[PDB]
Amino acid sequence: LRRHAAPPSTNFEILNEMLNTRKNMSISLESSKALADSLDRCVDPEDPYFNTLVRIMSTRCMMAAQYFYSGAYSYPDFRHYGLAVDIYTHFTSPIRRYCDVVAHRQLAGAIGYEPLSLTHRDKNKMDMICRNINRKHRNAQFAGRASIEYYVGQVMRNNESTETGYVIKVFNNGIVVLVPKFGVEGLIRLDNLTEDPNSAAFDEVEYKLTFVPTNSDKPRDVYVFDKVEVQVRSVMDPITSKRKAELLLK
């Protein structure tokens, strides 16, 4: 089977903190339907992409779904939060998923087509299969996302363009902006963020970072969830040899 644990309150307390402070909103977390409804109404009229940004950000604070065998947990633990179903499994993709292969053999024995192999009726062997495909699943998505990272990083290799960015993380050492066009997150250090780093201030209560831009002299307050203009640029670090995307806001 395959279950999905309900997200802890601690994961959304930080998101609701930024929402209630800046946008004056909140996510219920009372139920999956409550979480969905509150996430749905979380939309800014001046910018349609704001709702998408919150969704792609509230996805990062969800518990990882995992494969398992029905003897390892009780029935209420079979619950899949993200789908709101009492029970669920992978079966439709035998070719690209070995979990389906197991499900196929079990269904064949379920209908009486052919007796189920002993290896799929051993609680010990099933535990090894589940712990393996869980690890291979994580390694698959990470390798997949890394493949996107390299090719996109090669597109912006020798190119600079003013794209649309969104502030997702605010710190005293700088900010982190997300470019939806390339799907790449970038870090703008305080030294390259503004002039006179000793004059800049960070308010944790409001998630606001006030500073004076390098090409200006007017105190600008940069809050969170703000749509800002950002110049993209790629440079391979001479120490890590990883193609990172250096971003300069405007």
């Binding site: 003897g71 007796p115 189920l116 002993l118 009726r121 609680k123």
Partner: protein
């Protein structure tokens, strides 16, 4: 105390077998109709095969696991015989040949086979766990004690429900059934025993050196057939098409292919029996729920 069997009765029952006749009118490969009755409490089950009557009771109590197995709970099976099943049985005779065999067959079929999830009997590792006990009561004996007990134990374990326990630190909080519903046991597989009885229609010489085999084998013998057999075979299987255990402890030498035939014949029986048990458990659950709805409605 002995059971006296005349030469006439010995010759008659054996000759009947030579004419494809058994006294109860069954078929050599025919298993007796198994009737399963559940009591009011969970774990209370009564199994009946013809005149054979056995009763099993499942119980559990908070106990501490062995030092060797801190993650496993305790599980024991009791099958003490009494003169109630017949004066042939001595009260408390737990060392007799047939008694120890029967005790060992059940143990290897349920305990050793891991039919019960003993790992799920642990509350807190190396400290407190559940101690499940299966007490078999032999009420009336007409043969097939081993098969009746294996069904009685399994039907009981699958019908039993233990009270919910919440544990904080040292303290144990045993929730009563009314406040919260009880929790069923974990069954890895459902073992069913089928016992074969062998009869030599000729003499020992034709059994040892005889060319063509002629030994008769019948399924689930009654008391009279059991007292006149020359060999016994108890084979345990499950719906997963696997042999849980086989025990032909001596007796009449039997052809290997014939013993294999018995194992395949027993598989067809254990399939029907297993499905039967499951159905009677569903209906029992539907019965208890329908009464729970009629109790809440009027309430």
């Amino acid at each position: 105390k002995d059971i006296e069997i005349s030469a006439s009765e010995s010759k008659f029952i054996l000759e009947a077998l030579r004419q494809n006749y058994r006294l109860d009118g069954r078929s050599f490969d025919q298993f007796r109709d198994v009737e399963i009755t559940f009591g009011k409490e969970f774990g209370d089950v009564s199994v009946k095969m013809g005149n054979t009557k056995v009763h099993c009771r499942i119980s559990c109590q908070i106990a501490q696991p062995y030092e060797d197995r801190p993650f496993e709970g305790l599980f024991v099976i009791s099958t003490e015989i009494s003169p109630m099943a017949g004066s042939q049985f001595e009260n408390g005779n737990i060392t007799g040949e047939d008694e120890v065999l029967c005790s060992r067959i059940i143990e290897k079929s349920v305990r050793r086979s891991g039919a019960l999830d003993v790992e799920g009997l642990c509350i807190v590792a190396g400290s407190k766990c559940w101690a499940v006990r299966a007490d078999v009561h032999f009420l009336d004996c007409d043969g097939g004690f081993i098969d009746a007990s294996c069904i009685a134990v399994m039907a009981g374990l699958m019908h039993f429900k233990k009270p919910d326990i919440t544990v904080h630190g040292e303290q144990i909080i045993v929730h009563p059934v009314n406040e919260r519903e009880p929790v069923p046991l974990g069954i890895l597989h459902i073992p069913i025993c089928v016992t074969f009885s062998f009869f030599n229609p000729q003499d020992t010489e034709e059994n040892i050196k005889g060319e063509t085999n002629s030994e008769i084998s019948i399924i689930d013998a009654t008391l009279k057939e059991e007292l006149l057999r020359d060999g016994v075979l108890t084979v345990t299987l499950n719906k997963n098409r696997e042999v849980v255990q086989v025990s032909k402890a001596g007796g009449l030498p039997m052809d290997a292919l014939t013993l294999m035939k018995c194992c395949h014949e027993a598989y067809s029986i254990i399939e029907k029996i297993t499905d039967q048990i499951l159905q009677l458990l569903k209906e029992d659950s539907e019965k208890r729920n329908k009464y729970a709805a009629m109790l809440t409605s009027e309430n």
